[PDB]
Design a protein around this nucleic acid. Sequence first.
RNA 1: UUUACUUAUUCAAUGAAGCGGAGCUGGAAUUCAUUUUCCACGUUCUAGCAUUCAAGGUCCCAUUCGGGGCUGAUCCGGGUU
Lengths: 233, 214, 52, 252
Amino acid sequence: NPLTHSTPKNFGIGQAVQPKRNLSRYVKWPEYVRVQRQKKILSIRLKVPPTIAQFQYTLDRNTAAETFKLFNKYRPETAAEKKERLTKEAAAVAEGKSKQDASPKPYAVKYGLNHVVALIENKKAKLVLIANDVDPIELVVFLPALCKKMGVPYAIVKGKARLGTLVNQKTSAVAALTEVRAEDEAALAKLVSTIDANFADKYDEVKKHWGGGILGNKAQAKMDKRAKNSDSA
Amino acid sequence: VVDPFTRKEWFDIKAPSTFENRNVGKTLVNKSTGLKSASDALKGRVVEVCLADLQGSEDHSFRKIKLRVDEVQGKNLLTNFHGMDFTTDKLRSMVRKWQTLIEANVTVKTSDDYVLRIFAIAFTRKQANQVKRHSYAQSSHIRAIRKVISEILTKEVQGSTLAQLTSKLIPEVINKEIENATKDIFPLQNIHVRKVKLLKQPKFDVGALMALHG
Amino acid sequence: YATVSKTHKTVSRAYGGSRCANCVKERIIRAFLIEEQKIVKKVVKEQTEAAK
Amino acid sequence: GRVIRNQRKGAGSIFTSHTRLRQGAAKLRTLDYAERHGYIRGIVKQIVHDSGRGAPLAKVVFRDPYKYRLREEIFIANEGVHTGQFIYAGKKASLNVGNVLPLGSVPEGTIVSNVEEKPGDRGALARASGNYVIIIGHNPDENKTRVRLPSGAKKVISSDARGVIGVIAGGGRVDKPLLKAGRAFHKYRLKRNSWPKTRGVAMNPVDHPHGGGNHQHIGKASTISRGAVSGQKAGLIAARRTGLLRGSQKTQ
RNA sequence: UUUACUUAUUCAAUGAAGCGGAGCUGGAAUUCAUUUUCCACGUUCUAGCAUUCAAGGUCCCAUUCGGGGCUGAUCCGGGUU
């Protein structure tokens, strides 16, 4: 206040120094970022096939929150605990001489593409969850259509990683559960009908579902200037 | 097999809001068949017709109105003021030998991003107990009357486009204004607009095209 | 050049080691004149848009 | 037969640009933010002539609007422009001689120079010594400015298309004979070796297509198809007319 | 048999800086009852000066010897043109 006196500075066109502006939109971009972003963007440019159009189309957050809320206690034996599996049938089958059946059969979450694929053909699985991931689209396209023609459940979720993280892997893509618990049997039933009206029957309408055909905010707002300011004012 | 008359649809032409009886005539255009129609493709058409039959007057039977195609709503397309041409027997009748004729050029624009050009041709007459069947001008007469007509029209056409332009040309305010002004010395009769035509419109936008409807 | 003193090489004046000072005289008079003509042609705008 | 001059010059070596001493090229200030919006307070450095041309160039330096910086850009010659002329550049900068902005952002009949089919090209057509261009049509629907070139072209460009008012400083350059082919030798000193030229009726059959004959003549009609072979190309390429020139070329 | 939008294909251009839309203010047709809408958005006497998160406006500092954003300069959305 005592000696705080200011003066004005113009910035308005053809004069004055233009300071720290948010270049975020128009910045120099390399070949790697160039294709990965315009990749999912060229995927919204043309119409998504009848087979796809389901990729981006998925389950709701809250329902999937429980499909992981109990799946965490279903973490397989890591290097240290898998080595602890070998020390339980070594201090039992020798010190008490057991007949193989000493440690109870596994009751955790299932992992494995080729195998969880064979689980739906023999429908030996109690539940099946599918992921809308994988770089090669045409590589895992048969997961949803087989579950449909065999009657096995499939809920496309956002997280093929958590499938394998709480399973000792990195990726898995198929989180099945042909078993259950002497208390978590309620989770099996509840989810079988919840995921039923989630995608199983939804496919009856999603039978000939097409997507895509969308442009950027640029060809969208000026698209609402020619074709929109044509009749509607 | 040709038979193109069964492919020509009939369109009805309407009139502006500054004129009477909107129903003019029934003409033909082109109905969509072997692929091709008549909508948002060309629209490079106008209208040539006297406002005398489009109003109801005989003693005042002159001044041809020029129009332009706007938008079509279910076989009922309107038109807007985009010109006003004349006939040759109108100019060749007013202009005789032994008298003086004048040419006055002027440019006037509006506030809707519209542009048009107007003209004005002036003539002379006699006085009480006239003997001589002749007499010319003196140059210091034609200069003054020219800059007077341009003044009144360039400040009475700006704003609300051709809506106000026609609100003074049909009721003849310009004809009685210049006639009584220079009447203090040398009057001069007739002096109309003659040929006047527009040529630059804004673009589209249904918002500005609705402010002038009836 | 780089092996002399300031008070020997160039001078202890404004733009003494850049232009010539003669073409620099027609500068201060041209620059300071349109800085006062700029405040004179600045406050006139502060009233041309105040009456309305 | 052997190979001919023009066909040999196609490969390149010495048929390059005789620059080095030259000040620069012909590229103004590419259209940007303030260039498509408002304008700028331009300042001309000088009118130094290019080392190898006919009409001089206006090295217009621009006051960088991104920090205290002054980069000298380049324009062509403008009939009567002094040193220190405030040549402003902007779509919102008024129509003045030497100043530049969009053709659709200005009137018809206006004669500009260094015209370009694209705004920010820094230089395209209407750039030769002493010539001009005239805007004969303005259609504000889809930015279209119909302008005319020196021979009579109707190239309708953009309304935001770059064009500076004025003619190229250097009129009457060819309206005066050189007499001495020595100053013709002095001009090519900083251009190229596209001179001196000779008659194919003088060279041998192998040397050039007109070649041979101890009586001197072409052999086959000088008239050649507008698209002849890269060996039979030397003469009258598409002369629908030939004798009393009317400047007609593609269709006039 | 016809024209549309763009993402493939393709041009030109920069050290991807000004994009689509809309909006803060004002002006410009005036309202069928109120926002029914179109244009600009610090720089035009003159071979000048323009640059350090700009200064200000405002709050936390645990007060200091010094510092930080927001707006200023609209904001929303990532499609450099």
